[model samples]
Target: PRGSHMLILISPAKTLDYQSPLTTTRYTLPELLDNSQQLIHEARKLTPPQISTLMRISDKLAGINAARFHDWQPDFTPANARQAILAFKGDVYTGLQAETFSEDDFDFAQQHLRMLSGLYGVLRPLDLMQPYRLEMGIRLENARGKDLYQFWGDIITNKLNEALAAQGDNVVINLASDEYFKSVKPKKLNAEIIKPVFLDEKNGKFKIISFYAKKARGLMSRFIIENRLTKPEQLTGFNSEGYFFDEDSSSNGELVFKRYE
Candidate 1:
């Protein structure tokens, strides 16, 4: 039996870090800048207080985002943009630990890993991104409708399908959070989607912990890329940070991995 290449999908982090040194001088612009510009136009209409309320962030964070929206431009350059993977810094990114990835790891990641975004739609790991704070779950009124989901509609799903077609794969390893993943219409996606669930043991029971699960998702991503895994079964070999596949708990389409500490 022939196995297809695996495509990993993960969420973009709200926390960003641009102070890090660039691993590569090469970069590519985001494909959805037109849609992004439209969103920025709408975002610029909101006051900092409104943004604060909409995103439920601190006033300072809201003000920073307001300025970011106001300053956003379609003409991205190395000076204004950074690679999506290196720019993102959160629990998942921390687990991903991209800073240590060799050139080969990045090359493999370019074809294997994708990040879901509110402003940019789907982003390759090396995609150049500017600063923005829109979440996919945000209900921002735009020409498309009352929310980002309506604005994105079938665009994200279609893009994912296109990527799978280009990669010659029908397999997708979904590691994104529900909010970001909601932007992708699963019914329209042209791939066999497999979701990995991470559970932690607490008080004699296994449960999902937000921070640990996010980091575990990143670890699994790194594991797949480092090994250049093509078949879904290879995913079972993932044993990072004490996580192991729970075969008895897993079913078709949903793979469960549990960690004991």
Candidate 2:
């Protein structure tokens, strides 16, 4: 009674500017999106071959931009804007809304999130990377019976099993399942997963100069550039949707490049 250890607990760790060291590199998502939109629009005027060439060239330039920031430190504070880039990367990987459990959808979605998480691990402070947690939530429209819930449970359970099985001792996320069937806000239906669970980037060389952020930014900048060329409006949305790279995956699947004399 004389020496009770008083404890202060913080859930869902956040990055704090004061608690964590600040990086000289100030990553701003809005500026990246704006700049990308402009470049993309200009690229659209070029011939298909020209556009392709520009894309490759732009990608290299973006990579150079990333390299320029290699000496900067990283920010670990929660509520920071940098996470927006991570969200975009994760979204592009899955190419699906946040709250989806369909087997086909889950395949790419899980892989995308897993890859981003792995990337985060490589970038974050080594000490903070381990002992973290992974969580999943599931819900359906207008089905609120025990049997229906159980069915949903089985579907999710089997899919997770197959996913984990494929991963097999790999760093696949540990899965946790939950069910909900109730009237809720439309926005809540599809919330982003793979949230920033820990606040601080691990110390040392990685934190001092994160290669991962640079790579992610370069990838994101390309996505922004391409989107602006074909679809300017997407730039307005923080979360870009329906954007595609001009490769075989292009919806038309036609090679659209030109050779300059």
Candidate 3:
């Protein structure tokens, strides 16, 4: 693994689905569950109305999550938890299309991909996750300070550093959204981070459409895993969904991809 050069970071989706059959029974627990428990405890203290306001979710959604936190338990089983990648369902997950992944693809993803979470802190692709929704931007006052970011201070960054070192490389491919990415202190992180920008043609100008960009992130992630890509340069070869690497719009830290349609 000395040549392992790319590690991908992505945000977890709020939308979850546990009805699908699992591809693999193998799962690992999140490393920072104790902290997650504490956050869950804090979440349990809020009323549905309070949760609705705090998380900017609808009252019904808040009620559902409130009940979820009340039912949240440390004893995770295949019966109770779903794999993180399989559970998430949103634009990124839609593009990722993990359900179709081969066993070898899953094995590669377990080593190279990471999911940033507000509750679990960090998760490998196959990490067993229970239902809960706490965004990194939540202003919940915790034992550490006034926000989840404060509670997760340096912990996530340190974990990423450890993962990079263990992989024998120092490159972080950031596919995470801004809110989730903020949890990691970039200055303290021990790797050279590269972010890929996805743009689409709209009204005669190229711009980042949120939905398309999110799916593109997942597509790029899939491209990396399917190809077993190890070098950063291999990323430009990504042409999924008609996207082409635009050297004119790219910079040292950011790679740009554009689609005319």
Top-lDDT candidate index:
3
lDDT of 3 by residue, 139-258 (tens): 999899999899999999987776776544478999999999999998998778899999999998999999999999999999999999988889999999899999989997999999
The lDDT per prediction is 0.89, 0.24, 0.90
Worst 10 residues of 1 by lDDT: 1-10
Estimated TM-score for each candidate: 0.96, 0.19, 0.96
Q: Which regions of candidate 3 are displaced past 4 Å?
A: 1-4, 166-169
lDDT (Cα, tens digit) per residue for candidate 1, span 179-223: 988988888887889999999999989999999999999999999
**How do the residues 1-261 of candidate 2 rate in per-residue lDDT, one tens digit apiece?**
111111000011111122223222222222122222332233233443442343344554434423322312233333422332223323122222222223433322222222212112111111122111111121111232322233233332232233232321221211111112111121322221211111113442113122333232233333333333222223223222221222332122121111111
**What global local distance difference test value does model 1 have?**
0.89
What is model 1's C-alpha RMSD?
2.4
Decide which is better by lDDT, 2 or 3.
3
Where does candidate 2 stray beyond 4 Å?
1-56, 67-71, 78-81, 84-86, 90-94, 99-113, 116-261
> Can you give the lDDT of residue 230 in candidate 1?
86
User: Each model's RMSD to truth, in Å?
Assistant: 2.4, 23.8, 1.7
Question: lDDT at 67 for candidate 3?
Answer: 97
